[PDB]
Write a protein that binds this ligand. Sequence first.
Ligand SMILES: Cc1cn([C@H]2C[C@H](OP(=O)(O)O)[C@@H](COP(=O)(O)O)O2)c(=O)[nH]c1=O
Ligand SMILES: [Ca+2]
Length: 129
Amino acid sequence: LHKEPATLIKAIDGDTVKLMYKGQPMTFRLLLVDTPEFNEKYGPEASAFTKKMVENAKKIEVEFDKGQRTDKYGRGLAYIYADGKMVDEALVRQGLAKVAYVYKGNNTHEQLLRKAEAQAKKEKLNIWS
Ligand SMILES: Cc1cn([C@H]2C[C@H](OP(=O)(O)O)[C@@H](COP(=O)(O)O)O2)c(=O)[nH]c1=O
Ligand SMILES: [Ca+2]
């Protein structure tokens, strides 16, 4: 896989962000995770966590997987990095997302994320508390 440039336009919630990619605004849905909706338990903390990560970053990057690059809603499907740290993984490591939506062909980072989830759960963090 390859990292490509993007710039933040706006934080949305725990697992969606609006980025400018190839000069066009698009909403990205983070691969292989599910955050709670803002209205649900840990939803606000997930949203805040992603927001801080993306807003504090000097360099945002998009990494597409091998599969589908857009979903049925028009959202970009990619892993998102903030100064080299994957947001998708970080949310899972902190117990603020579950590994989820694992589809054939877009699952390169599955086992990385599962390992993070196991550690969050062992620590009883947030969702796992
Ligand atoms: C993360 C992800 C979501 N989706 C679709 C499946 C779900 O459809 P439904 O809307 O029909 O439930 C929805 C979940 O996204 P959200 O968790 O953002 O709601 O987005 C994909 O198709 N591919 C993906 O990789
Ligand atoms: Ca969600």
